[PDB]
């Protein structure tokens, strides 16, 4: 297991999108995780449809939030998720419009990551690929992040409100970190990305709802 990995550099990571006024972080986080897997198993990186997730994952709340496992199980039970070309993102709730011919990826379940265990998370990133996780993004220091390894002690390591995607890890000026991909546009963070404190005691509660799909 390497000291550093960065699935952007391995073609596993699609461009950064903007969710907008819609609370669909969980959808982008699922679609990105499925994208990382679809690339691992077929070798081809195709943009998947988070709008498919927000319309049709009826155990979730659309632009009111949801769970990523809830979406993985959905694409398992439904037999596929569409590509973002077939099913573009519009940022607003609507009725399900899943065309099965437009099916671009399948799923065979999901695995969750032991709560608290950052060592387990690192391993999972190293040997599976991008992982779907959820953090406390409520703080102003996060909404106006730009660079460096983010750490704010007021970060609730217990209650978690925003879904991002882990697309690798590493160290920088001595601080071990996680590389996460957000859905707030390229104007947020470091062109849509952020580094998060790693091995600093589960900062922002990143291993609370970590998961990835099976392919």
Curated annotation (Swiss-Prot):
Tissue-by-tissue expression: Predominantly expressed in bones. Expressed in thyroid epithelial cells.
One GO term (biological process): negative regulation of cartilage development
Catalytic class of the enzyme: hydrolase
Family, as annotated: Belongs to the peptidase C1 family.
Annotated knockout phenotype: Enlarged thyroid follicles, reduced extension of the thyroid epithelium, and slight increase in the levels of Tg/thyroglobulin in the thyroid follicles. Loss of localization of CTSB/cathepsin B and L to the apical membrane of thyroid epithelial cells. Serum levels of thyroid hormone thyroxine (T4) are normal. However, reduction in T4 levels is more severe in CTSK and CTSL double knockout mice compared to CTSL double knockout mice.
Keyword Transmembrane helix: no
Keywords: Cell membrane, Disulfide bond, Glycoprotein, Hydrolase, Lysosome, Membrane, Protease, Secreted, Signal, Thiol protease, Zymogen
Main location: other
Subcellular location: Lysosome; Secreted; Apical cell membrane
Record: glycosylation sites: 99
Protein name (database record): Cathepsin K
GO molecular function, one term: cysteine-type peptidase activity
GO cellular component: apical plasma membrane; external side of plasma membrane; extracellular space; lysosome; nucleoplasm
Annotated function: Thiol protease involved in osteoclastic bone resorption. Displays potent endoprotease activity against fibrinogen at acid pH. May play an important role in extracellular matrix degradation. Involved in the release of thyroid hormone thyroxine (T4) by limited proteolysis of TG/thyroglobulin in the thyroid follicle lumen.
């Amino acid at each position: 297991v390497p000291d550093s990995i960065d699935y952007r550099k391995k073609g596993y990571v699609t461009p950064v999108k903007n969710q907008g006024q819609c609370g669909s972080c969980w959808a982008f986080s699922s679609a990105g995780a499925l994208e990382g897997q679809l690339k691992k198993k077929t070798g081809k990186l195709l943009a998947l449809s988070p709008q498919n997730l927000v319309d049709c994952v009826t155990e979730n709340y659309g632009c009111g939030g949801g769970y990523m496992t809830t979406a993985f199980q959905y694409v398992q039970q439904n037999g596929g998720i569409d590509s973002e070309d077939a099913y573009p993102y519009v940022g607003q709730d609507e009725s399900c419009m899943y065309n099965a011919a437009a099916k671009a990826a399948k799923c065979r379940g999901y695995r969750e990551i032991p709560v608290g265990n950052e060592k387990a998370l690192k391993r999972a990133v190293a040997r599976v690929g991008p992982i779907s996780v959820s953090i406390d993004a409520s703080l102003a220091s996060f909404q106006f992040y730009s660079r460096g390894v983010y750490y704010d002690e007021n970060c609730d390591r217990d209650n978690v409100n925003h879904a991002v995607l882990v697309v690798g890890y590493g160290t920088q000026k001595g601080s071990k970190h996680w590389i996460i991909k957000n859905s707030w546009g390229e104007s947020w963070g470091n062109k849509g990305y952020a580094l998060l404190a790693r091995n600093k005691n589960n900062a922002c509660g990143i291993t609370n709802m970590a998961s990835f799909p099976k392919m």
